[PDB]
Structures are given as structure tokens and as C-alpha cells.
């Protein structure tokens, strides 16, 4: 596999968004789907997280109260599509479903799940598919106030995961391709968080914060 | 109907039909002494205001308080005049009945000790505000607001 990957350099990734006061997995799903749609059509179109939060309750999601990227991919599949950010703007509160087929700009036929706990299988998925939806243990001030560098938090769990984000690459700092490795992750806390909205998380350090425990990607 | 140990907890808004919604979600978040308590995600603008000390008493009722270095007061979940959608204020700590939700180990309904009035009053959420919700008392519960207490 490549020693480094960065899907942003290829045009697969939209700018960093802000979920604001809503606990909305929706941004991780829309990011993985923006990725696949691009691989497929050559166009980068920002998708609607609000569409996911308002309409995916039948699939088992709970809007601002939480959910699962995989259930979001399921909603897209059952719904036959998902609207653009532009046509169904984000308001960060639970509202009535207002999906419009005429405005759908993406689709998936279901999704794929990355082998649990496997960092090599996740590296494979990011090298061959594009940006991947993952869950992580984000509940520590070290991460909440992360600013730069390779994130490592000794108390990070690889089991109790509370935050859905997006892996858009991997790489290594310094000279050794196998030294100081990291996962390149896009957050949804706006550009002012971390390093322009992005965080590097320790890679191949025993599934740090659980990035490889519950990864998935939509099939388009 | 459960025994939550005294300690420090983060309280996630959930529901009786969906006690574990997945990743993300919202948490009881303090925004100032005597100000309504809010439901907010575990993100930077809010993360440090989501820890609460829970403490049970002889009647089997608990208080839910906030402590934060230099809070000038000792405040927690509070009520005075309870009415539908009245906000939960961060006032003088009141007592609540924490009833374990069945098929769960850490999900609780937060009730106002008010059953001899004939109605059920529980802490819920309207928008991004914790509020008091009224429910007719019957013989089957059924979608009620609840709270996952996770021990810090």
C-alpha cells in the first residue's frame, strides 16, 4: 500500500463543517458519501446532514440525539437518495423530514464494514476506497482541546466510542515510513478546531481511540 | 428502581424506546448559575460543563449538582413552580427520583417526587433546553425521556 495517502489532495473532500449544537454521525456519513460520489462522478458536491438528521429515524437514528453512520448509509439506500447541502440546509435542530427527490444528488446501495479492530484492514480501506467513516473515543479534554501533532491519549478507549468522524488519509512524521505513523482525520467542529479542523491520531498504536473498531463506507 | 452510586457523571439525553442512539447525542450542560440547564453535544464549547455530582439520600432521592473549580454557589438541577415545559434551572439543588429503565443498566428516568399530585413529571428536553414533561399515570409507560448516567 502507499506509505501516505491524502484524499483531500485528490479533490474527494469538502471544506470542514460545524455540527454546532446538535449531536449529529451525520457529518461522518455525508463526508464518506461525498467521497464515493466523487470517485464515481468526478463532481464534489456537499451533502445535507440535515436530511440525514430529519429523515433517518425509521432506520434507527435519532437526529441530534445521535445515531450511526451505517444507518445513515441504510437510509440513503432505502430512500433512493440524499439532498445537497444547498437545497436542504443545515439548521442543527431536529425538524420534520423535507426530502425532495428532485434535489437528490447522491445515492448508495448499502455499505461495507471494515473488519473490527483491524488497523491494517482500515489502511487498506483508506488506500483503495477513499475517505472512511469511523467512530472514536473523543471524550477527553486532550482531544476536545487538541491543537496539533499526533494525538495520543493513554486513557483513550478502543471500545466505548462516542464520536463519528472521517479518515481521509494516513502518513508518518519524520524519516521512517513506519515511524510516528498517524491517521489523518477530518472532524466536524469547524476549521478553528485542531489543525484547521483536522487531527492526526496515532496509527498502529493498538487501535488508538478505536478508529478501526467500527469503520464503514457506503457502496455507490 | 436502581442504585446509582454517588459520584461524578455525564448525563446523556435518551429515551425509553431508544436507550442507546449510537454515537454523538446530547448532554446536560450547565450555562451559568441560575440559568436554564441545556442539552448540548460533547464538543469543545461545552465539554467541560457536563460533569455532575449525583448523591442519594435517606428517602431514596437524589440531587444532581454541578461543581466547576470556582462556581460561586453549589447549584444543581432545580424546580420551583413546575408546569409543562418549565425549564430545569441550575438553582438550589432539588431532589429527584432516579428510576432505572428496564433492560438497561445505566439509563434512568429523572422524576420530580410528585406522585401524590396524580401526574408524572420527568426531566426531558424541548429544543436544546432541559424541561419538565408531564405524563398521565397509567399501567404501561411508553416513550418517556430518560438519561444515561456514565460514571466519570
Coordinates of C-alpha atoms in Angstrom, one line a residue:
Chain A
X1 CA 0.0 0.0 0.0
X2 CA 1.1 3.6 -0.4
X3 CA 3.1 4.8 2.6
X4 CA 1.0 8.0 2.7
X5 CA -2.4 8.9 1.4
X6 CA -4.4 12.1 1.4
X7 CA -7.7 12.2 -0.3
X8 CA -8.0 15.9 0.0
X9 CA -5.1 16.3 -2.5
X10 CA -7.3 14.5 -4.9
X11 CA -10.5 16.5 -4.5
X12 CA -12.5 13.9 -2.6
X13 CA -13.2 16.2 0.4
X14 CA -15.4 19.2 1.1
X15 CA -14.3 22.0 3.4
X16 CA -14.6 21.4 7.2
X17 CA -18.1 21.9 8.6
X18 CA -19.5 22.7 12.1
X19 CA -22.3 20.5 13.7
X20 CA -22.9 23.2 16.2
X21 CA -25.4 22.5 19.0
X22 CA -26.6 19.2 17.5
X23 CA -25.0 15.8 18.4
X24 CA -25.1 14.8 14.7
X25 CA -22.6 10.6 12.8
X26 CA -24.4 12.5 10.0
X27 CA -21.2 14.6 9.2
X28 CA -19.1 11.4 9.1
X29 CA -21.6 9.7 6.8
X30 CA -22.0 12.8 4.4
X31 CA -18.2 13.0 4.3
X32 CA -17.8 9.3 3.3
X33 CA -20.6 9.7 0.8
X34 CA -19.2 12.9 -0.7
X35 CA -16.0 10.8 -1.2
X36 CA -17.6 7.9 -3.0
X37 CA -19.8 10.2 -5.2
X38 CA -16.7 12.0 -6.3
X39 CA -14.9 8.8 -7.1
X40 CA -17.9 7.8 -9.2
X41 CA -19.0 11.0 -11.0
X42 CA -16.0 13.3 -10.8
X43 CA -18.0 16.0 -9.1
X44 CA -17.6 17.1 -5.5
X45 CA -21.0 18.1 -4.0
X46 CA -21.6 19.0 -0.4
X47 CA -24.3 16.8 1.0
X48 CA -27.1 17.6 3.5
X49 CA -26.6 16.4 7.1
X50 CA -29.9 17.9 8.0
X51 CA -31.6 15.5 5.5
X52 CA -29.9 12.7 7.5
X53 CA -31.0 14.1 10.8
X54 CA -34.6 14.9 9.9
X55 CA -35.4 11.7 8.0
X56 CA -33.5 8.7 9.2
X57 CA -35.4 7.9 12.3
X58 CA -37.2 4.9 10.6
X59 CA -33.7 3.4 10.0
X60 CA -32.9 3.7 13.7
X61 CA -31.1 7.1 14.0
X62 CA -32.2 9.8 16.5
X63 CA -31.1 13.1 14.9
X64 CA -29.4 15.5 17.3
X65 CA -29.6 12.7 19.9
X66 CA -27.3 10.5 18.0
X67 CA -27.0 7.6 15.6
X68 CA -24.8 5.5 13.3
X69 CA -23.1 6.3 10.0
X70 CA -24.0 2.7 8.8
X71 CA -27.8 3.5 9.5
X72 CA -27.4 6.8 7.6
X73 CA -26.0 4.8 4.6
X74 CA -29.0 2.5 5.0
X75 CA -31.4 5.4 4.9
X76 CA -29.8 6.6 1.7
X77 CA -30.3 3.2 0.2
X78 CA -33.9 2.9 1.3
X79 CA -34.7 6.5 0.5
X80 CA -33.3 6.2 -3.1
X81 CA -31.2 9.3 -2.5
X82 CA -29.9 12.3 -0.4
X83 CA -30.2 16.0 -1.0
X84 CA -27.4 18.6 -1.5
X85 CA -26.3 20.9 1.4
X86 CA -27.5 23.7 -0.8
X87 CA -31.1 22.5 -1.2
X88 CA -31.6 21.2 2.4
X89 CA -29.5 23.4 4.6
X90 CA -28.2 22.5 8.0
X91 CA -30.0 24.2 10.9
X92 CA -28.7 21.9 13.7
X93 CA -32.0 21.1 15.4
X94 CA -34.5 18.1 14.8
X95 CA -37.2 19.1 12.3
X96 CA -39.7 17.4 10.0
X97 CA -38.4 15.4 7.0
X98 CA -38.4 17.6 3.9
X99 CA -36.5 15.3 1.5
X100 CA -37.1 16.1 -2.2
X101 CA -36.2 13.5 -4.9
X102 CA -35.8 16.4 -7.4
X103 CA -32.9 17.6 -5.3
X104 CA -31.2 14.3 -4.6
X105 CA -27.5 14.4 -5.7
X106 CA -26.2 11.2 -4.2
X107 CA -27.1 7.5 -3.7
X108 CA -25.7 4.3 -2.3
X109 CA -26.9 0.7 -2.4
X110 CA -25.9 -0.1 1.2
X111 CA -22.4 -0.1 2.7
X112 CA -19.4 -2.1 3.6
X113 CA -18.0 -2.7 7.1
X114 CA -14.3 -2.8 7.9
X115 CA -13.0 -5.9 9.8
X116 CA -13.3 -4.8 13.6
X117 CA -10.2 -3.6 15.4
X118 CA -8.0 -4.0 12.3
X119 CA -5.7 -1.1 11.6
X120 CA -4.2 -2.9 8.6
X121 CA -7.6 -3.5 7.1
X122 CA -8.5 0.2 7.7
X123 CA -5.3 1.2 6.0
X124 CA -6.4 -1.0 3.1
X125 CA -9.8 0.6 3.0
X126 CA -8.4 4.1 3.0
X127 CA -5.9 3.3 0.3
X128 CA -8.3 1.6 -2.0
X129 CA -11.7 3.2 -1.4
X130 CA -11.3 6.8 -0.3
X131 CA -12.3 8.6 3.0
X132 CA -13.7 6.2 5.6
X133 CA -16.4 6.7 8.3
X134 CA -15.1 5.7 11.7
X135 CA -16.3 6.0 15.4
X136 CA -13.7 7.0 18.1
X137 CA -13.4 7.7 21.7
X138 CA -13.4 11.6 21.8
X139 CA -14.3 12.1 25.4
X140 CA -11.1 13.6 26.9
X141 CA -10.0 17.2 27.2
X142 CA -6.7 16.3 25.4
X143 CA -8.8 15.7 22.3
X144 CA -11.5 18.4 23.0
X145 CA -8.7 21.0 23.1
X146 CA -6.4 19.1 20.7
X147 CA -4.3 21.6 18.6
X148 CA -1.5 19.9 16.6
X149 CA 0.8 17.0 16.4
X150 CA 0.0 13.3 16.6
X151 CA -2.7 12.7 19.1
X152 CA -2.1 10.0 21.8
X153 CA -4.1 9.9 25.0
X154 CA -3.3 7.0 27.4
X155 CA -6.8 6.8 28.7
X156 CA -8.4 6.5 25.1
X157 CA -10.7 3.6 24.9
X158 CA -10.9 1.4 21.8
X159 CA -14.3 0.0 22.8
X160 CA -16.5 2.9 24.2
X161 CA -16.7 5.1 21.2
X162 CA -18.7 8.4 21.2
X163 CA -17.9 10.5 18.1
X164 CA -18.3 9.8 14.4
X165 CA -15.5 11.3 12.2
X166 CA -13.8 10.8 8.9
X167 CA -10.5 9.2 8.0
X168 CA -9.3 10.9 4.7
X169 CA -5.7 9.6 4.9
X170 CA -2.7 8.3 6.7
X171 CA 1.0 9.0 6.8
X172 CA 4.1 9.4 9.0
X173 CA 6.1 12.2 10.6
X174 CA 9.9 12.3 10.4
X175 CA 12.0 10.0 8.2
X176 CA 10.8 6.5 8.7
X177 CA 7.6 5.4 6.8
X178 CA 7.0 3.2 9.8
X179 CA 7.9 5.7 12.5
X180 CA 5.5 8.1 14.0
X181 CA 2.6 7.0 12.0
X182 CA -0.8 8.7 12.0
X183 CA -4.4 8.6 10.7
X184 CA -5.4 11.8 9.1
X185 CA -8.9 12.6 10.3
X186 CA -11.4 15.3 9.3
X187 CA -13.5 16.5 12.4
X188 CA -16.9 18.4 12.3
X189 CA -16.1 21.1 14.9
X190 CA -15.4 23.8 12.4
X191 CA -11.9 24.9 10.9
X192 CA -10.9 26.7 14.2
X193 CA -10.7 23.3 16.0
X194 CA -7.4 21.3 15.9
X195 CA -5.2 21.8 12.9
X196 CA -7.6 23.7 10.5
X197 CA -10.4 21.3 11.6
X198 CA -8.2 18.2 11.2
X199 CA -6.4 15.9 13.7
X200 CA -3.7 13.3 13.3
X201 CA -4.2 10.4 15.5
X202 CA -1.5 7.8 16.5
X203 CA -1.6 4.9 13.9
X204 CA -0.6 1.3 14.6
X205 CA -0.5 2.0 18.3
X206 CA -3.0 -0.7 19.2
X207 CA -6.1 0.8 17.6
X208 CA -5.8 4.1 19.4
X209 CA -9.2 5.7 20.4
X210 CA -10.9 2.9 18.5
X211 CA -10.6 4.3 14.9
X212 CA -10.6 0.8 13.4
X213 CA -13.3 -0.6 15.6
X214 CA -16.4 0.4 13.8
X215 CA -15.4 1.7 10.4
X216 CA -17.6 1.6 7.4
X217 CA -18.1 3.1 3.9
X218 CA -21.1 3.5 1.5
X219 CA -21.3 1.4 -1.7
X220 CA -22.1 3.5 -4.7
Chain B
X1 CA -35.6 1.4 40.6
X2 CA -31.9 1.2 40.7
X3 CA -28.9 2.2 42.9
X4 CA -26.6 4.6 41.3
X5 CA -23.5 5.1 43.4
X6 CA -22.7 8.6 44.5
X7 CA -20.1 10.1 42.1
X8 CA -19.5 12.2 39.2
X9 CA -21.4 11.6 36.0
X10 CA -22.1 12.8 32.4
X11 CA -25.9 12.6 31.7
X12 CA -26.8 11.7 28.1
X13 CA -30.4 12.5 26.8
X14 CA -32.0 9.4 25.6
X15 CA -35.4 7.9 25.6
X16 CA -37.2 4.8 26.8
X17 CA -37.9 3.5 23.3
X18 CA -34.2 4.2 22.2
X19 CA -31.9 4.0 25.3
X20 CA -28.8 3.9 23.1
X21 CA -29.0 6.0 20.0
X22 CA -25.4 5.5 18.7
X23 CA -22.5 7.9 18.6
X24 CA -22.9 11.7 19.3
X25 CA -26.0 12.9 21.1
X26 CA -26.7 15.4 23.8
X27 CA -25.8 16.0 27.4
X28 CA -27.0 18.0 30.4
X29 CA -24.9 21.1 30.3
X30 CA -24.6 24.0 32.7
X31 CA -24.6 27.5 31.3
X32 CA -24.4 29.7 34.3
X33 CA -25.6 29.9 37.9
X34 CA -29.5 30.3 37.9
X35 CA -29.7 29.8 34.2
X36 CA -31.7 27.1 32.4
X37 CA -29.7 23.8 32.0
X38 CA -29.1 22.9 28.4
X39 CA -28.9 19.7 26.2
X40 CA -25.7 20.0 24.2
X41 CA -23.3 17.7 22.4
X42 CA -19.9 16.6 23.7
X43 CA -18.0 19.2 21.8
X44 CA -15.3 21.9 22.8
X45 CA -17.7 24.8 23.6
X46 CA -19.5 22.5 26.0
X47 CA -17.4 19.5 27.1
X48 CA -16.2 20.9 30.5
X49 CA -19.7 21.9 31.7
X50 CA -21.2 18.4 31.5
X51 CA -20.0 16.8 34.7
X52 CA -22.4 16.4 37.6
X53 CA -22.2 15.0 41.2
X54 CA -25.1 12.7 42.0
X55 CA -25.9 12.0 45.6
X56 CA -28.6 9.8 47.1
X57 CA -30.4 10.4 50.4
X58 CA -32.4 8.6 53.1
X59 CA -35.7 8.9 51.3
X60 CA -34.0 7.4 48.3
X61 CA -34.0 10.6 46.4
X62 CA -31.0 12.2 44.7
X63 CA -29.6 15.6 43.9
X64 CA -27.7 16.3 40.7
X65 CA -25.1 19.1 41.2
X66 CA -22.6 20.9 39.3
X67 CA -19.1 21.7 40.6
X68 CA -16.6 23.6 38.5
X69 CA -13.5 25.0 40.2
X70 CA -14.8 28.4 41.0
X71 CA -18.5 28.2 40.8
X72 CA -19.6 30.8 43.4
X73 CA -22.5 28.8 44.8
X74 CA -23.2 25.0 44.7
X75 CA -26.0 24.6 42.3
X76 CA -27.8 21.8 40.5
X77 CA -31.0 20.6 38.9
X78 CA -33.7 22.7 40.4
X79 CA -37.5 23.4 40.2
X80 CA -39.9 25.8 42.0
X81 CA -43.2 26.1 40.2
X82 CA -43.4 23.0 38.0
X83 CA -45.5 23.3 34.8
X84 CA -45.4 21.6 31.4
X85 CA -42.1 22.8 29.7
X86 CA -40.9 24.8 32.6
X87 CA -37.1 24.9 32.4
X88 CA -34.8 22.9 34.7
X89 CA -32.8 25.7 36.3
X90 CA -29.3 25.4 37.8
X91 CA -30.6 26.6 41.2
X92 CA -30.6 25.3 44.8
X93 CA -30.4 21.5 44.2
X94 CA -33.7 19.7 44.4
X95 CA -34.4 16.0 44.9
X96 CA -35.4 13.7 42.2
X97 CA -36.4 10.0 42.0
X98 CA -34.0 8.2 39.6
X99 CA -35.9 5.1 38.2
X100 CA -33.9 2.6 36.3
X101 CA -35.2 1.8 32.9
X102 CA -35.8 -2.0 32.4
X103 CA -33.4 -3.8 30.1
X104 CA -30.8 -1.2 30.8
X105 CA -28.0 -1.0 33.4
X106 CA -27.4 2.8 33.4
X107 CA -30.5 4.5 31.9
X108 CA -32.7 6.5 34.3
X109 CA -35.9 8.3 34.2
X110 CA -35.4 11.5 36.3
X111 CA -38.7 12.2 38.1
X112 CA -39.9 15.1 40.3
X113 CA -41.1 13.5 43.6
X114 CA -44.7 14.4 42.9
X115 CA -46.8 11.3 42.7
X116 CA -49.5 12.1 45.3
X117 CA -50.5 15.0 43.0
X118 CA -51.6 12.3 40.5
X119 CA -49.3 13.1 37.5
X120 CA -45.9 12.1 36.3
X121 CA -43.4 14.8 36.0
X122 CA -40.0 13.8 34.4
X123 CA -37.0 15.8 33.2
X124 CA -37.0 15.9 29.4
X125 CA -35.8 18.2 26.6
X126 CA -37.5 20.8 24.4
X127 CA -35.1 22.1 21.7
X128 CA -31.8 22.4 23.5
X129 CA -33.3 23.1 26.9
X130 CA -33.9 20.5 29.7
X131 CA -37.5 21.0 30.7
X132 CA -40.2 19.3 33.0
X133 CA -42.5 17.0 31.0
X134 CA -46.0 15.9 32.3
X135 CA -47.4 12.4 31.6
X136 CA -50.7 10.8 32.7
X137 CA -50.0 8.0 35.1
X138 CA -51.3 4.6 33.8
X139 CA -50.2 1.0 33.8
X140 CA -47.7 0.9 31.0
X141 CA -45.1 3.5 30.5
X142 CA -44.3 4.3 26.9
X143 CA -41.7 6.6 25.5
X144 CA -40.5 8.7 28.2
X145 CA -37.4 10.9 28.3
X146 CA -34.5 9.2 30.0
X147 CA -30.9 9.8 30.9
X148 CA -27.8 7.6 30.7
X149 CA -25.6 8.2 33.6
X150 CA -22.0 7.4 32.7
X151 CA -19.6 7.4 35.7
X152 CA -16.6 9.7 35.1

